[PDB]
Amino acid sequence: DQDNEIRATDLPERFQLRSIPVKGAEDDELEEEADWIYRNAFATPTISLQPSTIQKIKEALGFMRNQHFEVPFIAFYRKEYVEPELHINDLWRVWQWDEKWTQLRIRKENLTRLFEKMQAYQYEQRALDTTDMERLKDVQSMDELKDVYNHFLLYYGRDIPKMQNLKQASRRDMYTICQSAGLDGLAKKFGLTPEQFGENLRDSYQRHETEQFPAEPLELAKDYVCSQFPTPEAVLEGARYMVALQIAREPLVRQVLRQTFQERAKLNITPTKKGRKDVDEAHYAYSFKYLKNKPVKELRDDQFLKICLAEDEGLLTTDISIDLKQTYFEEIKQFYYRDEFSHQVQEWNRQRTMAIERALQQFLYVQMAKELKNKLLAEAKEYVIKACSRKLYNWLRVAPYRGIRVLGIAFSSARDHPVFCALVNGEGEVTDFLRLPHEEREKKAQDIETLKKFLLNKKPHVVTVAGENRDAQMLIEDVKRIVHEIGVELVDNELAILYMNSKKSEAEFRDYPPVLRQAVSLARRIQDPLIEFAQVCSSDEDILCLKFHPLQEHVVKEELLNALYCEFINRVNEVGVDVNRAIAHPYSQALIQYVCGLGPRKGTHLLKILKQNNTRLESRTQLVTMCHMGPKVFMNCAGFLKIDTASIEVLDGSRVHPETYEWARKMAVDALPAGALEEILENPERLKDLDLDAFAEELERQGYGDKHITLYDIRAELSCRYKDLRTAYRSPNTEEIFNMLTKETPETFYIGKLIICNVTGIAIGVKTRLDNGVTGFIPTKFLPEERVKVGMTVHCRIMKIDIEKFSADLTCRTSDLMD
Amino acid sequence: SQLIFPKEFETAETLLNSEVHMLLEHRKQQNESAQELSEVFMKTLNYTARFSRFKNRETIASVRSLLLQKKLHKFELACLANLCPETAEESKALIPSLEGRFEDEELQQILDDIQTKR
Amino acid sequence: MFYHISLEHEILLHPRYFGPNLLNTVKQKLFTEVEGTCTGKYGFVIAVTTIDNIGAGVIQPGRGFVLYPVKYKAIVFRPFKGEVVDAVVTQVNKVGLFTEIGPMSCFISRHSIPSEMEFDPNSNPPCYKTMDEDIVIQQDDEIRLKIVGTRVDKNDIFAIGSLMDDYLGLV
């Protein structure tokens, strides 16, 4: 199986599950990437509101393609070649555009082979000059590679026996009919060739001059009439059709009009009859249900995703056009025009000016607007995936709290089903659990009491409450004063709900009830956030069942998997993973697949081979020989692959690569090896003894590279071994607290929103509850028991809101039904 | 195909993929002048707006008229006139049920006729 | 293919609509609950062109409903196997091609498409292609194909196609 081959070979693992096989470069191609990649990424402005680096991209592609360094090993241990400009995410951006560059050459290499076999056919017998070879070589975008390919298929596409040297299934355009009738000459005896019109357009003046033919178009039309084309007006139509199509598939014409649509293109929207009714203020289509002359550069982050989302269901019909609603046809009709006022020139200019417009209306306006739509949509799909990555960045950029024993309070709506809680070890395993099943209000005092009795036995360092309803806001005080008799934290449960329904946890926790299995993970999340996410979101359906954006179902799924899996591989390598922990604890087995070099295959293989030895990792050298794993992958994995030193080189528990162990000893020798094992370990005794600059020119001489800020790492690594740079665990501000419990967000706390409501009890004005559970105060200024009753539901618009008081003020007044 | 497989379609006149298009958009203009249509109707309207080689009531009517004069199978009357072959041999290769029936000169003539109506 | 046939349906009309616009309600319910239904004996039905006559409406004894037998001329699309049709391919996979002949979903196997075509993944319209990229079948290509297998599932009809012949390629 290939699962053996991935395990066998010495490449980084994700290099092998990349769809294109990774191959080295020859420093000219590797330059042809970094100037293309810096052009097609990092520099071209988006059409939506969202220099020296070429050396860094050149360097980064050297590590990836040639020396086979994955993005974690480059963004931390080779920072001199990439920093300042290339962040760790830009190294992930470059590796994605190497994928796109390779497909461009792979298709161009297959397209140069196709043109030369046509010249092998043509010279064996229009003109395939080297210009047709030149633009094929000069292709920079995959869009340009389609103009060339369509241009080639227009003329020489009707040449099948190039493969003879299962027939063709002939075309459907009318061009093949007319060129079978030999109207090429009458198309040719138009006053220009399509290519020279293209030179007019990119230069915006009549550089090439129209070659007027001294005849009448109609009296020249008599020569070409046939059985296929009677009526010499029909050979005017049959000729202007070729002129439009030859203008259309001419790349110089198609490129210049494309760059007009980049800048001057307008988005006009109208709704269907089905969209004149379903569109309301709550619908996402309110902000654009009617639009006129909106330039596409005026589009905002995901506005165009929603517009094409509404068009997909059937609500909206839109068009993208260049002219306003001085047209661009008027701009360019002069470029194909003789100003001579002779009569025969006038009909020839008449035929020329109505062939050029058919190219616009029939051919170019259709194809350029669709292409621009796909490019705008791909921008808007990318914004969401960036937004779905910033959110996973934030959930993982939180430090573990200050072995920590944590008890986790998880509750559902508390009626016919009780509140649970589960304690966890200092290393993540379960210890003990409890039930808290909240007149019978006096029986709640019994449940309050037993909380102290249990926390006196085992001592949490913090209790965590799963914000699941608005009911959590007071439960906080309940356990808070149980403690007043150690902290309390409001921790959300969005992955805990997934942890419940995960079949993986049911293998872990079979007898444990649902809200108890949820109660495990919050004490696991605060224990460390990264370890839980790798466990629970270890499958494609799992990680996508979280909510990062409303629109995340409408972006390319496998792209969204990659931009989320890169954030894991970013954080896991930055944090590092302790191996011999994970052989014992299966809860940390899912971390190692996100180390560079490892993955789903070598990760399972490494832990299994250790189970063949049933031994402990003491050194990184144990991995290379006694775990017999290749030095190429070892140069990726070992720089991030923690070993607990209190279990023997102590540098195996540091962010120091095995190959740079020796330069780390010279950081400790000049603090005056074996004696220096503990010298800076026990104090950073003085930070100014190490002449970091003077080492660098010594590192210029021996060590053979600018290791300037590599030293700055090893200096700071000896100070604190694996200092976690994750932000220390703060407590939620009331904004998060308001948003966790109400399960909805400041784009749904719209002030002006006609909402459902429920009046539950009056204790001054009328007080109502939402289905979210917040308190809605109907103002006395808008107020009488007879006018508004008790117990019912009434349409209500908000005039004032907050986040700290859960006030969601209503109106009930029909004079608020506008504005 | 060559034989009619079911038993009911024979007494049921076949429509060109352009005549379908014009009467489906007739249904469209009928609808918005006065409920909303199915996915099958709209998707078929798009499909038959792709492959609609004739655009005028006179043109489709003329194509109907010629193919009625030329005395051929009712299934093949539309399976060519909305497929529009160029060569007679491609008409024979696509249609296993028209070979051995017609002579090639008038075949190319009437193919030129239907292409002339476009 | 696109036939214009005459077929019959029965309308169970509820006594609310026994007013002056009873016949209009019969017509409206015919247009509603037959248009788009895929009867595998008669294929898909596109739009009811006309109604010949609305029959005599028998009151169902004890149920109140009136069962009007309506006969109507409607457009029908039928996939007779062994036919060349103008597909529009929409989703490409290792097993083959998944395409849309109109209302209909069709599938073409990897061994019902020619051997010189092979799956090229990872191109952004992932497509089957020749070795030297002669012609490529990506998303939205007007391929012609020979439907050779036809399966009815009482909801839609799924046809199985092939490109083992002359003139079965992109257009």
Automatic annotation (TrEMBL), chain B:
On whether Transcription is a keyword of this UniProt record, the answer is yes
Q: Name one GO biological process term.
A: transcription initiation at RNA polymerase II promoter
Give the primary localization class.
nucleus
| GO CC, any one term | cytosol
The UniProt keyword set, sorted, is:
DNA-directed RNA polymerase, Nucleus, Transcription
Residue stretches making up the RNA polymerase Rpb4/RPC9 core domain = 7-118
What's one GO MF term for it? translation initiation factor binding
Compartments annotated for it: namely: Nucleus
Q: Which domain of life is it from?
A: Eukaryota
Entry annotated with the keyword Oxidoreductase: no
Biological role: Core component of RNA polymerase II (Pol II), a DNA-dependent RNA polymerase which synthesizes mRNA precursors and many functional non-coding RNAs using the four ribonucleoside triphosphates as substrates. Pol II is the central component of the basal RNA polymerase II transcription machinery. It is composed of mobile elements that move relative to each other. POLR2D/RPB4 is part of a subcomplex with POLR2G/RPB7 that binds to a pocket formed by POLR2A/RPB1, POLR2B/RPB2 and POLR2F/RPABC2 at the base of the clamp element.
The record's family statement is:
Belongs to the eukaryotic RPB4 RNA polymerase subunit family.
Q: What is this protein called?
A: DNA-directed RNA polymerase II subunit RPB4
TrEMBL record, chain C:
Entry GO CC: DNA-directed RNA polymerase complex; nucleus
Q: Write out the GO biological process terms.
A: DNA-templated transcription initiation
Task: Please name the InterPro entries in this protein's record.
Answer: NA-bd_OB-fold, RNA_pol_Rpb7-like_N_sf, Rpb7-like, Rpb7-like_N, S1_domain
Domain (S1 motif): residue spans on this chain: 80-162
Keywords associated with the record: DNA-directed RNA polymerase, Nucleus, Transcription
Q: In which compartments does the protein localize?
A: Nucleus
Show the GO MF annotations: nucleic acid binding
* SUPFAM superfamilies tied to this protein: N-terminal, heterodimerisation domain of RBP7 (RpoE), Nucleic acid-binding proteins
What job does the chain carry out?
Answer: DNA-dependent RNA polymerase which catalyzes the transcription of DNA into RNA using the four ribonucleoside triphosphates as substrates. Core component of RNA polymerase II (Pol II), a DNA-dependent RNA polymerase which synthesizes mRNA precursors and many functional non-coding RNAs using the four ribonucleoside triphosphates as substrates. Pol II is the central component of the basal RNA polymerase II transcription machinery. It is composed of mobile elements that move relative to each other. POLR2G/RPB7 is part of a subcomplex with POLR2D/RPB4 that binds to a pocket formed by POLR2A/RPB1, POLR2B/RPB2 and POLR2F/RPABC2 at the base of the clamp element.
Q: Which family does it belong to?
A: Belongs to the eukaryotic RPB7/RPC8 RNA polymerase subunit family.
What this protein is called in its record is DNA-directed RNA polymerase subunit
In its UniProt entry, the species of origin is given as Sus scrofa
Taxonomy-wise, where does this protein's organism fall, top ranks first? Answer: Eukaryota, Metazoa, Chordata, Craniata, Vertebrata
